[PDB]
Scaffold this motif. Structure first.
Motif, PDB file in Angstrom:
ATOM      1  N   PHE A 138       0.861  -1.215   0.000  1.00  0.00           N
ATOM      2  CA  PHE A 138       0.000   0.000   0.000  1.00  0.00           C
ATOM      3  C   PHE A 138       0.882   1.244   0.000  1.00  0.00           C
ATOM      4  O   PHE A 138       0.580   2.231   0.671  1.00  0.00           O
ATOM      5  N   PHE A 139       1.973   1.188  -0.756  1.00  0.00           N
ATOM      6  CA  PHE A 139       2.894   2.315  -0.836  1.00  0.00           C
ATOM      7  C   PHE A 139       2.758   3.022  -2.179  1.00  0.00           C
ATOM      8  O   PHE A 139       2.987   2.424  -3.231  1.00  0.00           O
ATOM      9  N   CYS A 140       2.387   4.297  -2.138  1.00  0.00           N
ATOM     10  CA  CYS A 140       2.231   5.067  -3.365  1.00  0.00           C
ATOM     11  C   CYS A 140       2.809   6.469  -3.211  1.00  0.00           C
ATOM     12  O   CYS A 140       2.188   7.343  -2.607  1.00  0.00           O
ATOM     13  N   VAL A 141       3.994   6.682  -3.770  1.00  0.00           N
ATOM     14  CA  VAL A 141       4.635   7.987  -3.695  1.00  0.00           C
ATOM     15  C   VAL A 141       3.851   9.026  -4.491  1.00  0.00           C
ATOM     16  O   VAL A 141       3.649  10.149  -4.031  1.00  0.00           O
ATOM     17  N   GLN A 142       3.414   8.648  -5.689  1.00  0.00           N
ATOM     18  CA  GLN A 142       2.659   9.564  -6.536  1.00  0.00           C
ATOM     19  C   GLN A 142       1.608   8.806  -7.341  1.00  0.00           C
ATOM     20  O   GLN A 142       1.940   8.057  -8.260  1.00  0.00           O
ATOM     21  N   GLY A 143       0.341   9.002  -6.994  1.00  0.00           N
ATOM     22  CA  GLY A 143      -0.745   8.328  -7.700  1.00  0.00           C
ATOM     23  C   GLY A 143      -0.374   6.881  -8.012  1.00  0.00           C
ATOM     24  O   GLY A 143      -0.968   6.252  -8.887  1.00  0.00           O
TER      25      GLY A 143
END
Length: 16
Positions: free
Chosen positions: A1-6
Motif C-alpha cells: 500500500f505504498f504510493c509515492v505519486q498516484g
C-alpha cells in the motif's frame, strides 16, 4: 500500500 505519486513508485511498487 505504498504510493509515492498516484502509485508511480517505479522503484518500490510495493514498499520502498
Amino acid at each position: 500500500f505504498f504510493c509515492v505519486q498516484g502509485x508511480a513508485n517505479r522503484f518500490x511498487i510495493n514498499v520502498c
